[PDB]
Curated annotation (Swiss-Prot), chains A, B, C:
GO terms for cellular component: cytosol; GroEL-GroES complex; membrane. This is Chaperonin GroEL. SUPFAM superfamilies: GroEL apical domain-like (SSF52029), GroEL equatorial domain-like (SSF48592), GroEL-intermediate domain like (SSF54849). Belongs to the chaperonin (HSP60) family. The lineage of its organism: Bacteria, Pseudomonadati, Pseudomonadota, Gammaproteobacteria, Enterobacterales. It comes from Escherichia coli (strain K12).
Amino acid sequence: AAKDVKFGNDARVKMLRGVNVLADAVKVTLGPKGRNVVLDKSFGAPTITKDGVSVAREIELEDKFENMGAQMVKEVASKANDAAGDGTTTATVLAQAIITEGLKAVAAGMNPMDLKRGIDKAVTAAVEELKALSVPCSDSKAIAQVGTISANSDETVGKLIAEAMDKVGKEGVITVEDGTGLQDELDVVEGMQFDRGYLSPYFINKPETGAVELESPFILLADKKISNIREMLPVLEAVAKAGKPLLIIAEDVEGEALATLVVNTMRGIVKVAAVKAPGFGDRRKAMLQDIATLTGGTVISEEIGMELEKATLEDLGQAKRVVINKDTTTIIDGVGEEAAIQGRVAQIRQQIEEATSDYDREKLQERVAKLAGGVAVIKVGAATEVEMKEKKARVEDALHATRAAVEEGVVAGGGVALIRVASKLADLRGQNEDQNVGIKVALRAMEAPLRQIVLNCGEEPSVVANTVKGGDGNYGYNAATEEYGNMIDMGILDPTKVTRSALQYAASVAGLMITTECMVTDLPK
Amino acid sequence: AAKDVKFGNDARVKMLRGVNVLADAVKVTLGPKGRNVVLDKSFGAPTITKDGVSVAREIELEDKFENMGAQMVKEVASKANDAAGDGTTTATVLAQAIITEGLKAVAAGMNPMDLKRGIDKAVTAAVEELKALSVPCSDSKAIAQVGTISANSDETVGKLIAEAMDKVGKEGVITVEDGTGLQDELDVVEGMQFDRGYLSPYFINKPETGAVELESPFILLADKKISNIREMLPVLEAVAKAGKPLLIIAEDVEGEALATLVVNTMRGIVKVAAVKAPGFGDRRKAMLQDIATLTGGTVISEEIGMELEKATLEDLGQAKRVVINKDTTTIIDGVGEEAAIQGRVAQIRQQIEEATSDYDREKLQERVAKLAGGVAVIKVGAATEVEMKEKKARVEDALHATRAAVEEGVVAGGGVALIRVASKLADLRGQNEDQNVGIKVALRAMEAPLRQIVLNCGEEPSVVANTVKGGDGNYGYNAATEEYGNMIDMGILDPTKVTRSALQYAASVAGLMITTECMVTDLPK
Amino acid sequence: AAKDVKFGNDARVKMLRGVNVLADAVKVTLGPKGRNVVLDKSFGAPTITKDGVSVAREIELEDKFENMGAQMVKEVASKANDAAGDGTTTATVLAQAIITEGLKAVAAGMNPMDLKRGIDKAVTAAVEELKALSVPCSDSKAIAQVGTISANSDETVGKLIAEAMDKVGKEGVITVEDGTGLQDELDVVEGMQFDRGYLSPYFINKPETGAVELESPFILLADKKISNIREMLPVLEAVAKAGKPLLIIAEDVEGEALATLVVNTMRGIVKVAAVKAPGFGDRRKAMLQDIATLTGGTVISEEIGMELEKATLEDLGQAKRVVINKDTTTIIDGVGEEAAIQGRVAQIRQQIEEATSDYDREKLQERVAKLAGGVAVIKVGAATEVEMKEKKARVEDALHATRAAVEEGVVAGGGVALIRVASKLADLRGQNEDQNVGIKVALRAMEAPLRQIVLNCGEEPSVVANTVKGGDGNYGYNAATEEYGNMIDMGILDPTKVTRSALQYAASVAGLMITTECMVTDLPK
Ligand SMILES: Nc1ncnc2c1ncn2[C@@H]1O[C@H](COP(=O)(O)OP(=O)(O)OP(O)(O)=S)[C@@H](O)[C@H]1O
Ligand SMILES: Nc1ncnc2c1ncn2[C@@H]1O[C@H](COP(=O)(O)OP(=O)(O)OP(O)(O)=S)[C@@H](O)[C@H]1O
Ligand SMILES: Nc1ncnc2c1ncn2[C@@H]1O[C@H](COP(=O)(O)OP(=O)(O)OP(O)(O)=S)[C@@H](O)[C@H]1O
């Protein structure tokens, strides 16, 4: 239809208003002293939440221009949340700071492209500087410490994460569900993890988590493009007779199949989920064979000649559980015999031995790693179900933070990492005045998180920020106790990966917003 | 859709207006001299009630922000009602007082978080002070007295509840039914009680009471989740042939099952209500076996291999009547033979003997307690049906108040307990000026119930409050007779539990509301 | 009446709008290719002028705040005009450029005071750079050249002014009148020069010239502060009998005295003007005695004991013509006998000889200089009266430009002096980022005059400015012939005192207006 076009400074001020609204709403909740934000619910009492993700998710604006500016900032912040699993409001605060200052400079007649270049130079220098500040978190002691800190200062969860990491390995797989007993337990069983997301969001049976949980499902294996609904009617009838949930592994699923599966799930007769095939090409076929070995299933490929119509329940694979993250999968305790798994591992090991290509050898090495290490499973232990769910959530987020710290490292949190790298990069200069201004904008915007935390605490942000800058090393402000001190000693730690991702994504969105003039949208109707 | 966002002081004033409206509407009906409140009935004459619960339930405003604030206060007040049984209007009055004073202080630039900390410290000291002031109510004489006072000064109900408590036990199960003869009767038979709530409010066949009553129903004992309606279609055919209502106890039911059961109940062909299974894991199965032994039913579990499709009426359990409270269940006189009942009791007794874990032994002990003590049945006795209903309601609310007093204790009522606690804590001080102001706000808000009661009586609230404060012990104001005196001599008594719950929940909602800035809601349309 | 107060950024934008309006209106007429501007005349046809002063004088805006901004810029531009004589539009263009860029920077969040400091540092460096670039104009050849260039390329007036200044002296005083014959005439006669302005503008009998012309007037000479009108009634009667205009030398006059003189001049019976006494103190008395010697008058002083009431026509002095200026005064051919003039000159010469104080000796030296050099009179010569007026105006403005060039020097005009200065000062840096920005604002605003001239010519200003910057020395753009070349060779020359004053005053107003927060006015009524 017709579309209103606003280009020039008016577009920029609309975008600025939108990012301002979203950033205020979401930054009010940053830190331990984050002030509550109450979101209206359609039916029943409103929810109260200091979680930045929820308040950001529930933000849409009336007028299209500032609404889409807010949507851009929200999308990049959610991307940052997906990258590291944390640091959403930090990313949005860094965004709001950089966009505000950069758009002020652009209104000041500066060249937007040079500002973009200066901000990019500043942020890459800050990223490598943070990598210089990073403290390794390889020892199990720091693993337990960060697990404790992430989960509201609980030592048991940190201990559990430490033991799981010791058992399954540094880069293994860790999952958590509920346990029957009051005591936490640990076990390791052959499993899986390949990075593929669900085809449609509607497969989520528990929206609050964002994944699915199929207790004892079948699993299908297919190297063939899902073309017609007629191909999987026999398996649908079989699974309906079985009264048991089902999963689908396919090369790709067509939109008509998307509509059919969504309709079937809404009907509730069959609980079917589908996910993209992992890997690619002959590697994809080999790992599909690995999954068939795991679950006792069989790969149905057109080249072989078999068809999805000729599929019996015996041909289908099985597992005792499966969870699909938004961009990852995990099957646990494949029914397939362990002797066959060992044989397949040995076969791929000789494939590694004969391998000459470096990247193919890396693919084979990670294939044997994921096929032999399996998955470590955690079961939470307490008395009542409310504490089951809350402690399960604590374990989940602590595991996310701990793995993020293991991947890259851990730096003194509380927003002092950014302060320290900013003070380090005080002498950075670009190729002209505009690039220098952009660099200074980035540097002064990287002080935003600490200032916001202090403002939420109620103290004067400028005084605390100046005091923190005066100190050196990890000297910083404690929001909880309102006392200065070595941030690492008091346990306030934030994974280097989360801060790096938040900073980089905020810089990316801010640079992309600074260099925008035209903005086409539907008419207000 | 688009969402209007209001953050800052305007959010606070909107929420203050909403709580003011709800608090006025519900506090006008506090105490014995509560003024009547009139509400719409869509068809017919309006209803008239001094009951705070109804007037609070029917309040929800037109503009979104104050509406949602009123919804917060209403939700917390209803939570207090569910926890204790009464004290809803007291909770809302305390919440209004604390909100008004706290927001007035926050407008004065005081730190919201410190105010919340001060209020929390004050209310914790207040709660332990109430526990200090608590008077035990273990004697049957005070049990009868509180039962009499709760039920509009009726001694017969106090006598009945005293006899029932003596017969079954202190922490037994008490139930009230309708009797044939004018004389009141009492009989105790093997029964059940586990704390689980209904899946959907639509199961409620009697909305005014909040539960359901099934005369001589079947009960379907299950162990797995409900995946398809096909699993219990033969059960539905059997219960339709029987023409007698049915209940479902199972691990869980899903959304399509809820829709199916709601549609079936609206049809009226089958009267079916489902409830979540009790316990957790192995003890869940143990108490399911206990239910099987009570009702003569059989546990259906996929692990055993049994399926819901092959369900026969003989396999179904039975009872002579069933009532499911909003968050509790009771089955009375399970048809199952009593012999197996004491066999199971003895078995679990030896399980207690061999038990080494303390909490598992506690679960086994409460299991044998609930399996041996059974349920008390107290059928009301009078001439006509109108007095049947009103006296049944009186027995219900008197039972709630009496058990609440038994659990914790009983303190001087009329709002004097809070006055005495506030006077005791007059010297409490926090860590700075803001926490001190918060503590003083809580303390001066503790005088709201007595002041409101006196204002409803039409006297001068400040004069009566000052006179009560001048006195010591339990010296207070008898609203009914408009004369001072020892509040316990004339029997005006409040359970410690209800006052404690009201105070704590008012403090909690006040802490959440004081520290709120952002408020997102749909546009006014 | 009440007063509307506007402080903050809205004040800056209001002032910016006002100065933008004034600057556009007045800058359209800059340079030789200045576009015509049409003003409005209350009665008759509109006037048409390319003169910047005329268009600026007639601009005041309906909105009060814009009007205050415009009036500030107009005041400082008129002050710049008064300092040198020509360069009003250049001053306004510089002021507009600096104001626009500086207020844009202030909106960019930079410190106004540091911006003002940077601009002041830049303009001081620019002023000393102009003094470096200055070329002496002592030779009569360049004097005739600049006289020709100022007077629309007329060589005769350049010749005349050269001869006159050779006759009198470098720092002499030059005057122009109308001659009976078509041939130009020149003569030197004993005269006077002291710097004092008219007490009220209403004394101006010729508003288009801003001065008074009294043919053969009497001159009063008084050292006493005017007190009452009765003191000069007898002299007023005497001069009314004489039927001749009068001029008054007095220590000072008050409100009622000047009001009565204004009333009398409006009546037209007596055409009397009054000017403040020159200098100060015993020097004032000594050169009042010099004036008495010049005109044959007498000093009337209370200390001597003589009063203004006792004043005969013989006591009054005489001259053959007198002209007042806004801040200057000259009397020509005092009737006083030349022998007395020589005697007084000798007396003050011996006073110089005995003088020991350096500054008193300087006053004595300039006193003898003005008492011996006298005045120059240049009678313009042509046929008709219209060319009489236009050539007299040409002589006046050429004389102003030539004396301005003689005082300080002459630099390559056409706006390239400032271009070269800005290019020279490209490496100047302040004490921080804000001062650096202010310096760059001043430097980029120095290019405004040439850009505006080129834009008036219709060419692309950026291209011509870049070409001129590329060249070095006095290479520049000729607006009239639209071809590049050497300014000195092409005769486009500007006094170094006309450009310095414009630049300094533009910088002064820009600094004074950048650091303006609050701005009160009267209500719009
Ligand atoms: N008590 C504390 N005092 C100071 N800084 C803290 C404290 N607790 C956490 N942080 C820091 O807060 C940053 C993360 O922001 P928070 O909102 O507090 O936590 P979060 O779980 O990351 O929430 P978001 O919305 O994802 S940023 C990290 O740099 C932590 O080191
Ligand atoms: N005769 C009395 N004199 C003084 N106070 C009384 C008297 N009778 C009851 N009260 C008090 O009045 C309050 C009763 O409040 P209600 O009007 O029943 O509402 P509520 O108990 O706060 O909550 P609900 O859900 O409405 S019962 C309690 O604090 C009693 O202690
Ligand atoms: N032929 C020319 N080529 C280029 N520039 C010229 C030429 N003739 C004059 N100029 C410049 O044009 C400007 C003359 O400006 P004007 O229009 O006279 O206003 P102004 O001199 O700034 O002030 P006033 O009071 O109006 S005279 C000076 O900067 C001259 O150096």
